[PDB]
Structure 1
Amino acid sequence: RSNVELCRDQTQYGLIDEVHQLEATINTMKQKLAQTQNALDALFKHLARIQADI
């Protein structure tokens, strides 16, 4: 947008807020991934234990 028509609008602020909120959501989803993987590993451990017992 040329010269003086470049303006600071509520649109700008809304988009920036979107970006920042988005990074936060990104991080939280990754954390959930971490915990789920831990749970899966533990369950496989007990599965192996049980088969040996059998």
Structure 2
Amino acid sequence: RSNVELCRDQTQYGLIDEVHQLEATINTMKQKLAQTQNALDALFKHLARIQADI
């Protein structure tokens, strides 16, 4: 900013807040992706069993 006009305002705090919230969100999406994949795999196993029975 400047020599002495380098001031810490509420905007700084807010930016750090959105940062942290965003990493939390990223963790949440990875978590949800995991169970999505698990459910898909279970469906595949079911279908294979059904086809063999057919």
TM-score relative to the length of structure 2: 0.98
Deviation at 1:21, TM superposition (A): 0.4
RMSD, matched Cα:
0.4
Structure with more of its chain in helix, by fraction: 1
Deviation at 1:13, TM superposition (A): 0.2
Q: Which runs of 4+ in 1 moved over 3 A?
A: none
What percentage of aligned pairs have identical amino acids? 100
Give the equivalent residue in structure 1 for 2:41. 41
TM-score relative to the length of structure 1: 0.98
Provide the C-alpha distance between the structure 1 equivalents of 2:18 and 2:46, rounded to a whole number of angstroms: 43
CA deviation string 1:1-54 (max 9, x = no partner): 111100010000000000000000000000000000000000000100000000
Gaps of 5+ in 2: none
Gaps of 5+ in 1: none
